Amino acid sequence: VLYVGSKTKEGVVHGVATVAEKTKEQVTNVGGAVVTGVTAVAQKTVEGAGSIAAATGFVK
Amino acid sequence: VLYVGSKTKEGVVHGVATVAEKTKEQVTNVGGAVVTGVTAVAQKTVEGAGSIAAATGFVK
Amino acid sequence: VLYVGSKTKEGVVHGVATVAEKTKEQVTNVGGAVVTGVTAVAQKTVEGAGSIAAATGFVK
Amino acid sequence: VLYVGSKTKEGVVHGVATVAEKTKEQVTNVGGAVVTGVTAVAQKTVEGAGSIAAATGFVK
Amino acid sequence: VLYVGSKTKEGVVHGVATVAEKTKEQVTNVGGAVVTGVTAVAQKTVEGAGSIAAATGFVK
Amino acid sequence: VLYVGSKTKEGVVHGVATVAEKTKEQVTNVGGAVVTGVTAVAQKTVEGAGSIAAATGFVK
């Protein structure tokens, strides 16, 4: 903060990987959210913050 | 904080990985959220914070 | 905090990994959240904190 | 052989995997063979066979 | 052989994988073979066969 | 051979993969062969066969 002579690595997302050979997925969403994969979030702030990921409301 | 001469690695997400050979997933969501995969969150703040991941509201 | 000359590693999520060969999952959610996979959260703050992951409300 | 209506899987080498985080190996061979890792052999014939893996002779 | 109505998978090498994060290997071979890694062999014949891997002679 | 109505996968090498993050290897070979990596061999014949991989002679 006041001083940094470092090699800082702050708030990052690193090395995320996936592999697939023969995938047969038949997602049939009818409401709300549906996530089948990779979702990386990396954010820094100074006041207030969100980062709401893969969420869903149904208010009615 | 006041001084850092470090090799800091703070708040990170590292090394996440997955593999698949023959997967047959038939998700059939009808409401709310559904997550079948990888979700990485790496955030920082100074006052307040969220990071709500893979959540769901259903008020009614 | 006031001084650091170390190799600090804070709030990290490291080394997560998964494998699959022949999986047949037929998730049939009808309400709320359903998580079948990998979820990584790594957050820090100075006042207030969230990190609510894989949750679900049903108020009515 | 004479008939096959199957899902034959012969001579296969499958699923081999390895991981490493912090390894300090200082192999200092002076003679013969030295293997530190992964070696996969998958062979078939009709008359005669080899597959001599990770061997070493010293005749003198 | 005479008939095949199959899904044959013969003599193959599949799925080999490796990972590394911080490796410090100081191989200092002075003679013969030295293998530190991945070697895949997948062959077939009808008469005679070799596949000699990671071998070494020292005749003298 | 005489008949094939199949989906044959013969003699192949598949899915070979590797990863590295911070590797400090100082191989210092002085004689013979040295292999640090990936070596895939896939060959088919009808009479005679080699496939000698990562070998080394020292006759003297």
DSSP string, F40-52: EEEEE-SS-----
Q: What is the DSSP letter of C35?
A: B
Q: What DSSP character marks residue F22? A: E
Alpha helices for F1-60 (secondary structure H): none
Half-sphere exposure in the Cβ direction for D41 (13 Å, CA): 18
E31 → chain F, closest CA residue: F31
DSSP annotation of E45 reads: -
| D22 burial level (CB within 10 Å; 0-12, 13-18, 19+) | exposed
Q: Which runs of consecutive H residues, i.e. helices, occur in B1-60? A: none
CA–CA distance from F35 to each of B58, B59, E34, F25, F58 (Å)?
59, 62, 6, 12, 17
The residues facing D44 across adjacent strands are E44
Between positions 3 and 32 of B, the ones with CB within 8 A of C are: 3-32
Q: Which technique?
A: cryo-EM
DSSP tag of D23: E
Q: How many distinct helices (H) and strands (E) make up chain F?
A: 0, 5
CB pairs below 8 Å between A and B: how many?
A: 237
- Locate E49 and state its tokens: 């066969």
**Least Cα separation, residue F32 to chain A (angstroms):** 36
> How many Å from the N-terminal Cα to the C-terminal Cα in chain E?
46
Q: Which residues of chain D does E46 touch, with a Cβ-Cβ cutoff of 8 Å?
A: 45-47
Please enumerate in sequence order all residues whose Cβ is within 8 A of that of E53, keeping only pairs 6 or more positions apart, or say none.
Answer: D39, D41, D52, D53, D54, E39, E41, F51, F52, F53, F54, F55
- Resolution of the experimental structure, in angstroms: 3.2
Q: Per the CB < 8 Å rule, is B12 touching A7?
A: no
Is E29 close to D34, i.e. CB distance below 8 A?
A: yes
Which residues in F1-60 belong to E strands, given as ranges?
9-10, 13-14, 22-23, 34-35, 38-44
Cα separation of F19 and C35, whole Å? 28
Looking at beta carbons, which residues of chain D come within 8 Å of C19? Answer: 17
User: Which member of C12, C43, C58 has the closest CB to residue B14?
Assistant: C12
User: How many Cα atoms are found within 13 Å in the side-chain-facing hemisphere of C60?
Assistant: 10
F25: helix, strand or coil: coil
Can you tell me whether residue D33 is helix, strand or coil? coil
The secondary structure element, H or E, covering residue D53 is none
With vertex at residue A25, the alpha carbon angle to CA A20 and CA A31, rounded to the nearest 5 degrees, is 130
3-state percent breakdown (helix, strand, coil) of chain F, nearest 5: 0, 30, 70
F44 phi and psi angles, rounded to 5 deg: -135, 150
Cβ count near C47 (within 10 Å): 10
Q: How many DSSP H helices and E strands does chain A contain?
A: 0, 5
Residues B51 and A24 sit within 8 Å (Cβ to Cβ) = no
Give the annotated binding-site residues of A for Cu cation: 14
In angstroms, the CA E39 to CA E36 distance is 9
Q: How far apart are CA C26 and CA A55, in angstroms?
A: 21
CA distance C20 to D17: 13
CB contact under 8 A, E37 and F34: no
Chains E and D lie in contact, requiring 3 or more CB pairs less than 8 Å apart: yes
Angstrom distance (rounded) from CA A55 to CA F50 = 58
Query: Hey, what long-range contacts does A37-41 have (CB within 8 A, 24 or more apart)?
Result: A37/B37, A37/B38, A38/B37, A38/B38, A38/B39, A38/B40, A39/B37, A39/B38, A39/B39, A39/B40, A40/A13, A40/A16, A40/B13, A40/B39, A40/B40, A40/B42, A41/A13, A41/B40, A41/B41, A41/B42, A41/B43
- Residue F40 has phi, psi (to 5 degrees) of -110, 130
B-chain CB neighbours of C54 within 8 Å are 53-55
Q: Residue B40 annotated as binding? A: no
**Backbone phi, psi, residue B7, to 5°:** -120, 50
